[PDB]
């Protein structure tokens, strides 16, 4: 499989302190990722509950319509770590960002061959291509 909103969420579930390691989502938003809202809510809620834990998370969502999804991520043996969790969080986050920058790149070039994006937007692409040339 791919990253998907599963690694970012399931890692945050198993490690709610990763909520302090996540950015303010400026280049992401809930618009560019149709489902990041679940991750963003979870982080936002973790930041709203200082001292929340892996197990206490389910108790904070006890009996919620979303608890079933959170149960799936909690019982998620597909990771089950805490050291690899942080590394995979950064790598996953990088993958999400990479993909959004890839999408943005294609959006920009799709607006060059017709609309004509600005000289700056056409240059932004060069810089972005250099960032993508070396992960």
Swiss-Prot record:
- Where, if anywhere, are coiled coils annotated? none
As one GO molecular function, the record gives: DNA-directed RNA polymerase activity
* Record keywords: DNA replication, DNA-binding, DNA-directed RNA polymerase, Magnesium, Metal-binding, Nucleotidyltransferase, Primosome, Transcription, Transferase, Zinc, Zinc-finger
Signal peptide positions on this chain: none
UniProt superkingdom: Bacteria
Annotated Gene Ontology cellular components are: cytoplasm; DNA-directed RNA polymerase complex; DnaB-DnaG complex; primosome complex; replisome
* GO BP annotation list: DNA replication, synthesis of primer; replication fork processing
The family note in this entry says: Belongs to the DnaG primase family.
Question: What is known about what this protein does?
Answer: RNA polymerase that catalyzes the synthesis of short RNA molecules used as primers for DNA polymerase during DNA replication.
Free-text note on domains in this protein's UniProt record: Contains an N-terminal zinc-binding domain, a central core domain that contains the primase activity, and a C-terminal DnaB-binding domain.
How it assembles, according to the record, is: Monomer. Interacts with DnaB. The primase-helicase complex is composed of up to three DnaG bound to one DnaB hexamer. Component of the replication restart primosome, which is composed of PriA, PriB, PriC, DnaB, DnaC, DnaG and DnaT.
Tell me the protein's name.
Answer: DNA primase
Give the gene name: dnaG
Give from-to of the shown chain within the full protein: 447 to 581 of 581
């Amino acid at each position: 499989k791919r990253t998907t909103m599963r690694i970012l969420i399931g890692l945050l579930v198993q490690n709610p302190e990763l909520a302090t390691l996540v950015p303010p989502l400026e280049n992401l938003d809930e618009n560019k990722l149709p489902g990041l809202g679940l991750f963003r809510e979870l982080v936002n809620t973790c930041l709203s509950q200082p001292g929340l834990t892996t197990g206490q998370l389910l108790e904070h969502y006890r009996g919620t319509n979303n608890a079933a999804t959170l149960e799936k991520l909690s019982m998620w043996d597909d990771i089950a770590d805490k050291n690899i969790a942080e590394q995979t969080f950064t790598d996953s986050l990088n993958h999400m960002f990479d993909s959004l920058l890839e999408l943005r790149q294609e959006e920009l070039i799709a607006r060059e061959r017709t609309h004509g994006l600005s000289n700056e937007e056409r240059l932004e692409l060069w810089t972005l291509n250099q960032e993508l040339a070396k992960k």
